[PDB]
Structure formats: C-alpha cells, structure tokens
Amino acid sequence: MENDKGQLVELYVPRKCSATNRIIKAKDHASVQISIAKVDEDGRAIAGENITYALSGYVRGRGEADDSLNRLAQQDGLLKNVWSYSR
Amino acid sequence: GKGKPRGLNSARKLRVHRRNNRWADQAYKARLLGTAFKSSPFGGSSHAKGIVLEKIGIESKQPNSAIRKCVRVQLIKNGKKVTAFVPNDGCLNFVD
C-alpha cells in the first residue's frame, strides 16, 4: 500500500499460506509454521538455519496438511518418491 | 434460480408481476381502490364538522379503568354518524 511519494503505509504485510496462497490472519490460531532443520553432509543439523513452511487453518482442518507438506518438501529437495503428481 | 425470470426480453413479466403483488400492500391498495373517497367517514378530508347527537361515556379497556367522555356526532357533508373523543379534564361540559 503506497501513496503519492512512495512511502509504504501498510501496517504490516501478512504471511500467506504456502499451499493455498491465502492470507493467514492475526487470529488464525489453527495455523502453524513448520520449521525443518537443514543438514550438512556429515549428517548433523545446522545452527539456526531452516526452511519454514506456513499453513493456514483451512488446509489443516481439511486434513490436507500432510499432502501439502509432502509436495512442498519434496519440491524443495527435502523428500523423494513419496508425493506423486499422478493419481 | 431465485424464482423470477431473468431473460433480457422479460420486462413485461417483471412489470406485471410487480403490479399484481403491489395489491398486497395496504397503502397502494387503499389509494387505488379509493377507499377514503368511498368508505371513510370524512371522505378523505383531514377534518369534518357535525352536530352532536348525544353524550356517551366509554369504558376504558384493560388494564385501565376509566370513563372516556365522548360525543356521538352526525356529519354535515354526508350525514354519517361517528363517535369523537372530547379531550381534556372537564371539556365535556363545554359541549352540549
């Protein structure tokens, strides 16, 4: 949200669901935010480095969070041959 | 859906349907039947004059108990008989 002389006046830019692109509201207490540790080649985690996935209450209540995270993770390289596009 | 036609050449149906159902509204039906002209005691006038025929007291309805002073009046323009309340304390003695 801009004005004439380019100053942003948005109070805060809210997060959106990674699976459905829906805005996660300030009272959306059923929404989560997964954080998954990224692993170095030894096999150990990494200090304070993650990729985080946001889900809204709607998908979690529809019982679709598992498949959505399967897709997102496997498409970011964190999974293989679990989620399949053809069914 | 919605139970009303939406076709772009359906103006006649819409207008006639509104015209039929406006008869269900009391004000429209009164002003198109002309009931004030034909059946109102005053004939549509705001005021009317008449001759007092008798004084009558009318029992107030529940949960009140009183005698509301009124006069039986015969109108001049049409000869109709109506009952009118005479409003204030002791104002019935002013009318005869």
Binding site: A37, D67, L79 | -
Partner: protein, 208 residues
C-alpha cells in the same frame, strides 16, 4: 538437499519388518492413499517402508530444528506408548505426557500444569484427540504417527506406521529418538550404534 547416506539402510528394514510396522489397517482413507503398497488375502494393506523411513527423517529434522528441547512434547493416551514417550523424553530432554491428557493443559494458563510446547508429537491421532484439538487453539504444529484408518484432521506431519502394535509403536519412537540424537550430535554417525538396545522403549506388561 540431503546426502545419500540415510537411504533406508537394510538394518533399519530389519528392525521395521521384524516389528511388523508395515501392517496397515484393514480399511484405509483417501488421505492415506499415497502410503499403501497393496492389499493382501487377509484384507489388511501394506504400508510402504521407504515413505515411512523418510517421513521419520523429516519429523526428526523438525524436532532438531527446535530451540530448548523441552518445547517438544510427546504424548500417548494408549497403554502402549507411555514407556516409549518417557524414554524419548529422557533420551532427548523433551517433555512427555503419559496416561491422561487433562483438557486445558495447553489453553488454560492459570493451571500449575500449563505447558507451551512448540511441537506436539503424538502416538495416535484418534485416541489422543484432546491434545491435537487443543493444539489447534494455540498454533502448535503436530507430528503424528498415523495408521491407515487414523484421522488426518489438524496434523502437519504424518508418519505412516502401524500404531496398534506394541513393538511397532515402541520401535517407531525408538527410531525417532535415534534420528534426533544423530542429528543433534549425541550419536557420532550412522555407523555408530547406540547404547540403548531396541527392546527398550517397549511397554512391558504390569504382570510379568
């Protein structure tokens, strides 16, 4: 990404197959379709094992990404996961909930049993409905051990595994704990074994 070092080592297949993990429930849900390998003459469905394994790895990375380890909550109402969750809490420093989950432990903030975990790890989504239902109120992600007939509402990560069997539940919890220790650094490497023998974590009968 992730190296080619995890790869469901055949000893892990030993442990899973001996513990009868792959024995899915006779009736499966639409949300559990990408987990069944096929059906068998008895009727029960077979759960894919590589899927289970790398879901365990994903879950373990979720636990490992968390700050102070007590913020991970493990729980089981069923009388097969108390020992497993207590052993996991001991070997990971997390917080366990065995037996009864008092309705209000997550939302009622004046109880002297108030807890604010960052993650809820649960044995059975159905028999432990209260914990998941309450996590939905306060924004807590849930990692669940789901069978083929377990409901999937209000779960983020599902580990597909037979959650009816004693050895199955104990083994799944044990592998989660071992993965978490390897990731944290307690266990030096995949080749290194563990001082904890597999038949630990396994709930014993209270009658000998």
């Amino acid at each position: 990404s992730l190296p080619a070092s995890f790869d469901l080592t055949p000893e892990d297949a030993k442990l899973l197959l001996a513990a009868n993990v792959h024995l899915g429930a006779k009736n499966v849900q639409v949300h559990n379709k990408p987990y069944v390998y096929k059906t068998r003459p008895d009727g029960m469905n077979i759960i894919n094992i590589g899927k289970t394994w790398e879901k365990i790895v994903l879950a373990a990375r979720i636990i490992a990404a968390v700050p102070n380890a007590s913020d991970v909550a493990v729980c089981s109402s069923r009388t097969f996961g108390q020992r497993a969750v207590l052993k996991f809490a001991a070997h990971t420093g997390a917080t366990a909930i065995a037996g009864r989950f008092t309705p209000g432990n997550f939302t009622n903030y004046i109880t002297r049993s108030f807890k604010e975990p960052r993650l809820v790890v649960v044995t059975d989504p159905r028999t432990d409905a209260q914990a998941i239902k309450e996590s939905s109120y306060v924004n807590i992600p849930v990692i669940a051990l789901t069978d083929m007939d377990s409901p999937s509402e209000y779960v983020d990560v599902a580990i597909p595994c037979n959650n009816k069997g004693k050895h199955s539940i104990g083994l799944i919890w044990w592998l989660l704990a071992r993965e978490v220790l390897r990731l944290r650094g307690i266990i030096p490497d995949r080749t290194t074994e563990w001082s904890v023998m597999p038949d630990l974590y396994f709930y014993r009968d209270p009658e000998e």
